[PDB]
Design a protein around this ligand. Structure first.
Ligand SMILES: Nc1nc2c(c(=O)[nH]1)N[C@H]1C(S)=C(S)[C@@H](COP(=O)(O)O)O[C@H]1N2
Ligand SMILES: Nc1nc2c(c(=O)[nH]1)N[C@H]1C(S)=C(S)[C@@H](COP(=O)(O)O)O[C@H]1N2
Ligand SMILES: [Mo]
Ligand SMILES: [Mo]
Lengths: 372, 372
């Protein structure tokens, strides 16, 4: 069994796949803390988890001339000033299950918890590349490609890329992270080194990093080429053409209700509605609207968070709103978020439906009853 | 009459205000050309148009130490390398009239044409500020404030600001423009000098520029403070608090149908649907979906445009789709656009309603009949 060496996990996780391991925290714990504890942080693995001996580990970085820089874990820790970045990772397939209700889709059936937040610590990717000898700026459209130590039966490693400009930008905060919430990277989260790409879909934050290569082209890996792309609702498997859509990098504005849960019976008087909101590209959440009547009338929620510099809001906003609720009524609780570019979420999931269940950001709706 | 000196305009414009002058091109000409001719480019004036004598004109630029740099038009032309940028300007109030159909709103009742595109030419704002002596980077959150030569009865000039980082960024393409579509700036469009801020709401592109000042604060002008801000649909004039919402800078993804027009009767056989799509922040339009049945089923439109570098898609995409249409049927033609961060447009206008009629980006719907 290729998975026998996989690490043990917290028992309260909502697992949608055991082998490879894919799981989200319970929604009732998801937004309980601003920083998601390491044991609860959602896990998305395509493959078996690498078993890495710390001392013999080497990160490979190709130089401008095609030579190779080889970095140990100790060197990565000591040569580069540690930078700490609080960033939310959200999977492209977050809230996929909601799309399946329109029409069955391909992919892991995530509920609202394919998203978590951590304080990451590591070397700036910028500094590692400048140390390798690369300039601040390359002419034309270049990419930094990453390969993981995890590989399929045939030997093809997990791979993804980001634009070179994001990799080199001080403000973009791209890390080669060896620390997560103040402790070393857990195995499930990329021990000993992962890329963290703030404001960008989880897919690009390559775990168990073995190689960094600068290329005039995007990662040729099938996960970069044939996955994590958004198509029109008319597109089906007979007509899909991966060349017609860009690889997801930045994600659009997103929010979900974490409290209460669908189908719950709540006591009369007062109810505290809670959830999360986030947007990609370092765009801050500037408002969250909350409705109890299916989106007919709205109230403005209270936002909790780090006030980050403009364009660098990498972490989610947690939100809450206390409302009066009357015994014997039915409520449909809805939330929608607005970001710093005033992007908004769409009303319904059908018009954003797609065959791969990606980019599920229509308003989250939670129907509950108020008991007598 | 304070407006007696205003310039004459093209007679086919859809004027919503004569004094001050505010008008959009007819929708049937709006997307006819990629570059909107100067005579048709939508015009938004708060005040009378300044009469500027070219030779005595001086642009005032405050230095880091509080001194003043004074630049003539000839100096602006000769001292700084001319840069050309093709950029779409869209007013915050574009498509405001559609919001009024939910509930009356305050503001000029724009239809879909408070948007136009031009090739702008001028000095980079970056170069002008570096020449004034400013560094590449100031610590903290700084702003570049602009004042126009147009002033209200009391003497308060039109004013707006942008973040300092955008002003200094080579990639952001902020111009002090003295040329528009290859000719000098028309009076209605800011003669002799306007700011053009690509990817950002029209409000910040200050016309008839008299002063550029670097400040630790946003523009204190009432147009920056008490206007062009997006609020929750629950907010009314008794409860509005301008401190609770950010000044609009980047705009969200937008699209409209320009052909055919609402209420038209079209011949059977084939119909070519056309329109525009655009998104702020240099985010490219990556797809436009078009429906004929009120948004139940969709087809992918053809996109026409400049393929710009990533993050620098300042110009709109024009789009078209040819479909079969059957005699004696009714169609509701709908378009929605998707940008490079996969932001999308929302289904309906009610949930994005606001008291000032801002940020109207719900799907544009055009009902027509197919004749026999
Ligand atoms: N090497 C490697 N890196 C990877 C993956 C993987 O399978 N292998 N999964 C990616 C995807 S699709 C997501 S959503 C995130 C999930 O990160 P987490 O498990 O730390 O939440 O890791 C990304 N990095
Ligand atoms: N000086 C000055 N600049 C200004 C304005 C103004 O009234 N005065 N209007 C602003 C607004 S709200 C918009 S939408 C754009 C419109 O530019 P246009 O008239 O060239 O289309 O100009 C901006 N710049
Ligand atoms: Mo993912
Ligand atoms: Mo405007």
């Amino acid at each position: 069994d290729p998975f026998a060496g996989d690490p043990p996990r917290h028992p309260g996780l909502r697992v949608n796949s055991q082998k490879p391991f894919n799981a989200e925290p319970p929604a009732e714990l998801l937004a309980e803390r601003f920083l998601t504890p390491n044991e609860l942080f959602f896990t998305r693995n395509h493959l078996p988890v690498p078993a890495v001996e710390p001392s013999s580990y080497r990160l490979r970085v190709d130089g401008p001339g095609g030579g190779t820089l080889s970095l140990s874990l100790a060197e990565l820790r000591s040569r580069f000033p540690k930078h700490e970045v609080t960033a939310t990772l959200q999977c492209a397939g977050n809230r996929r299950s909601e799309m399946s209700r329109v029409r069955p889709v391909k992919g892991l059936p995530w509920d609202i918890g394919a998203i978590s937040t951590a304080r990451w610590g590591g070397a700036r990717l910028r500094d590692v590349l400048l140390h390798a000898g690369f300039p601040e700026e390359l002419q034309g459209e270049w990419h930094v490609c990453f390969e993981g130590l995890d590989a399929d039966p045939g030997g093809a490693p997990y791979g993804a890329s980001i634009p070179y400009g994001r990799a080199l930008s001080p403000a973009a905060d791209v890390l080669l992270a060896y620390e997560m919430n103040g402790t070393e990277l857990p195995r499930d989260h990329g021990f000993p080194v992962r890329v963290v790409v703030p404001g960008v879909v989880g897919a690009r934050s390559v775990k168990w990093l073995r190689r960094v290569a600068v290329s005039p082209d995007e990662s040729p890996s099938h996960w970069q080429q044939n996955d994590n792309k958004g198509f029109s609702p008319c597109v089906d498997w007979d007509t899909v053409d991966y060349r017609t859509a860009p690889a997801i990098q930045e994600l659009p504005v997103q929010s979900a209700v974490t409290q209460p849960r669908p189908g719950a019976a709540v006591p009369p008087g007062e109810l505290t509605v809670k959830g999360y909101a986030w947007s990609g590209g370092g765009r801050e959440v500037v408002r969250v609207d909350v409705s109890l009547d299916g989106g007919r009338t709205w109230k403005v929620a209270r936002l909790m968070g780090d006030k980050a510099p403009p364009g660098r809001a990498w972490a989610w906003a947690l939100w809450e709103l206390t409302v009066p609720v009357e015994a014997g009524t039915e409520l449909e609780i809805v939330c929608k978020a607005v970001d710093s570019s005033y992007n908004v979420q769409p009303d319904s999931v059908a018009p954003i439906w797609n065959l791969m269940g990606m980019l599920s950001t229509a308003w989250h709706r939670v129907r509950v009853s108020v008991q007598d």
